[PDB]
Amino acid sequence: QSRTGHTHMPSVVGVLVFTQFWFWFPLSHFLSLAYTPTCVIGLNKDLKMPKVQYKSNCKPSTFAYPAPLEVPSITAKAKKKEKNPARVMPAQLKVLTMPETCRYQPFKPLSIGGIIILKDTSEDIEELVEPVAAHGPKI
Amino acid sequence: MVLESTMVCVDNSEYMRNGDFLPTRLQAQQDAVNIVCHSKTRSNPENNVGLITLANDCEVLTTLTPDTGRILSKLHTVQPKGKITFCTGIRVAHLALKHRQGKNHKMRIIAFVGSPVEDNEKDLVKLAKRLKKEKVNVDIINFGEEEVNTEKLTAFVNTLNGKDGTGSHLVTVPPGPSLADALISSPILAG
Amino acid sequence: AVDTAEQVYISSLALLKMLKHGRAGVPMEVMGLMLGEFVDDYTVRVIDVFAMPQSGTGVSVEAVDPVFQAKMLDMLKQTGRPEMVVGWYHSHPGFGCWLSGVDINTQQSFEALSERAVAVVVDPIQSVKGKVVIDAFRLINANMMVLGHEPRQTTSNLGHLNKPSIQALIHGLNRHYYSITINYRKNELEQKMLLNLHKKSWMEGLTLQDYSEHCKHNESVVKEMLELAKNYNKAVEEEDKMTPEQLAIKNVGKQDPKRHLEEHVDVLMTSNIVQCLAAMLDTVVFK
Ligand SMILES: [Zn+2]
């Protein structure tokens, strides 16, 4: 389902066709249609990318990645920057706390995770624009 | 060669043993069946020949098959009962033409009529309309007579015979002590 | 070099013909021929199945008479059976359903025309009447030993193909000799005709004949079964008199595998026939 409670059509289709691999195994390729990345968006302008750094009321070591083998009580701020927002648990959306000293702040109070924009409170110079990547595996 | 089915209908009434004509001409027309089946065998041995009578209770004596070795035996024991039956005699073969093995074999049915016809002109035009409708080659052979030979049978053939080009022929034999083999072999149907 | 996932469709025609052919499945080697139509690559359907006369040689390529085979097939072609042969079947009593060298040689010789060449071996001699599970056999290419043995997709049905899990024949001779899955099919005419035919095969003619027979035998014959039933009931109660002593002493663990409950429940079920048929006598007496 989505954040508002509505269910995604390509997610249900992707999971049912994903369960339809019993008769035809190559049908499992439709699982990518149900991949919904969990993150936040603080994009203010279409061509300008800002940097929003909040803080979590939980331990940062408890939310780290389970690094496998090699085989050759509170964090100061979150790890989400340049917005590269990482994964976020739906239970983590209640422990986020925006900093009071943050230069920028949206108009809508960020309470639950979703897609929102950023409002320029300073309306001054030094918007901190960052460049874009280059050719490689992607376009 | 020629791919067609042959059906013969012989009379089993007691009208075939009168001493005025041939001495029990049943054997003579049996030899006619022999020379037409051996002649068609010499032309195309893949032709099937059936045997059935025109009695009241029609009985298929031999199924359509090119093997005449047992047909020669089945030509005997004619069981001389009954007088004549025309409707189920036509319907017993013209409708049975669909049971043949080779679908490419054309439809050809002959009949040996030794008794006067009991059906009126209405049945003659209904059956002639049915046979002209389904387009089956019909050769009428009338052996022996009591009344005039062809009075309504003329219009029966003219209304039954379609496709005037190389169509069917009518065989009318006059009285005479000579054999019937050379007289019925004169048209193009034999050979 | 291509392979698909094939599955053999088995109707009740070939099944019942293999059951009558299994009744005629004498120790002597028997022969049979399967027919059908090939619609696509990975499906095969059998419709026509007949038997073959036995011979002193048994299952062999010399026993198959081509003029008799082609003669009967032609007689099926002149009738409403326009299906070509799809395979040949036989019976292997006693020594197992596996295929000897002669069978794989006549299979190699008979598979030159049909690429599928379905082979079925029925063996009802040592098989119990509880299950009629039958299996279809296949021939693998000798040049596929370098590459994978069976590159068959849809590996789900292999769990249903794992039911014949004998530890000597399947993987005891699985090299160069594999098998294929089997499914069934039943239309509504077979379902209602055979279903109502079997229910009627367990029912009466008018369905009202043998009811009053038991309704009135409850007073003549079943009375003996009721007295004997009470003799078994008391014959267990004589031990149930001793049960409250052990149950009054130990109360820990169970040592007697007898339950003494479900048997008496069944006795009550046999005793309820009088109650269920009393209303039947009420209907026969009423109207
Ligand atoms: Zn043996």
From Swiss-Prot, chain A:
Modified residues (Phosphoserine): 73
Highest taxon above the source species: Eukaryota
Residues passing through the membrane, by range: none
Subunit record text: Component of the 19S proteasome regulatory particle complex. The 26S proteasome consists of a 20S core particle (CP) and two 19S regulatory subunits (RP). The regulatory particle is made of a lid composed of 9 subunits, a base containing 6 ATPases and few additional components including PSMD1. Interacts with ADRM1. Interacts with ZFAND1.
Family: Belongs to the proteasome subunit S1 family.
Known function: Component of the 26S proteasome, a multiprotein complex involved in the ATP-dependent degradation of ubiquitinated proteins. This complex plays a key role in the maintenance of protein homeostasis by removing misfolded or damaged proteins, which could impair cellular functions, and by removing proteins whose functions are no longer required. Therefore, the proteasome participates in numerous cellular processes, including cell cycle progression, apoptosis, or DNA damage repair.
Stated name of the protein: 26S proteasome non-ATPase regulatory subunit 1
Organism from which the protein derives: Homo sapiens
Residues of the full protein shown: 749 to 935 of 953
UniProtKB/Swiss-Prot annotation, chain B:
Cross-linked residues, Glycyl lysine isopeptide (Lys-Gly) (interchain with G-Cter in SUMO2): 122
KW Magnesium (keyword) present: no
Biological process per Gene Ontology, one example term: proteasome-mediated ubiquitin-dependent protein catabolic process
Signal peptide: none
Keywords from the named record: Isopeptide bond, Phosphoprotein, Proteasome, Repeat, Ubl conjugation
One MF annotation (Gene Ontology) recorded for this entry: molecular adaptor activity
Sequence ranges assigned to domain VWFA in this UniProt record: 5-188
Keyword Amino-acid biosynthesis: no
GO cellular-component term (any): cytosol
Disulfide bonds: none
Annotated function: Component of the 26S proteasome, a multiprotein complex involved in the ATP-dependent degradation of ubiquitinated proteins. This complex plays a key role in the maintenance of protein homeostasis by removing misfolded or damaged proteins, which could impair cellular functions, and by removing proteins whose functions are no longer required. Therefore, the proteasome participates in numerous cellular processes, including cell cycle progression, apoptosis, or DNA damage repair.
Free-text comment on this protein's domains from its UniProt entry: The 2 UIM motifs are involved in the binding to a multi-ubiquitin chain in a cooperative way.
Subunit-level organization: Component of the 19S proteasome regulatory particle complex. The 26S proteasome consists of a 20S core particle (CP) and two 19S regulatory subunits (RP). The regulatory particle is made of a lid composed of 9 subunits, a base containing 6 ATPases and few additional components including PSMD4. Interacts with NUB1. Interacts with SQSTM1. Interacts with UBQLN4. Interacts with UBE3A. Interacts with UBQLN1 (via ubiquitin-like domain). Interacts with DDI2.
Family under the similarity heading: Belongs to the proteasome subunit S5A family.
Protein name: 26S proteasome non-ATPase regulatory subunit 4
Taxonomic lineage from the root: Eukaryota, Metazoa, Chordata, Craniata, Vertebrata
Swiss-Prot record, chain C:
Tissue: Widely expressed. Highest levels in heart and skeletal muscle.
Record bears the keyword rRNA-binding: no
Phosphoserine found at: 127, 201
Gene3D superfamilies: Cytidine Deaminase, domain 2 (3.40.140.10)
Alphabetically ordered keywords of this record: DNA damage, DNA repair, Hydrolase, Metal-binding, Metalloprotease, Phosphoprotein, Protease, Proteasome, Ubl conjugation pathway, Zinc
One GO location term (cellular component): secretory granule lumen
Role: Component of the 26S proteasome, a multiprotein complex involved in the ATP-dependent degradation of ubiquitinated proteins. This complex plays a key role in the maintenance of protein homeostasis by removing misfolded or damaged proteins, which could impair cellular functions, and by removing proteins whose functions are no longer required. Therefore, the proteasome participates in numerous cellular processes, including cell cycle progression, apoptosis, or DNA damage repair.
Entry-linked PANTHER family: EUKARYOTIC TRANSLATION INITIATION FACTOR 3 -RELATED
Listed name of the protein: 26S proteasome non-ATPase regulatory subunit 14
The species this protein was found in: Homo sapiens
Lineage: Eukaryota, Metazoa, Chordata, Craniata, Vertebrata
Name of the encoding gene: PSMD14
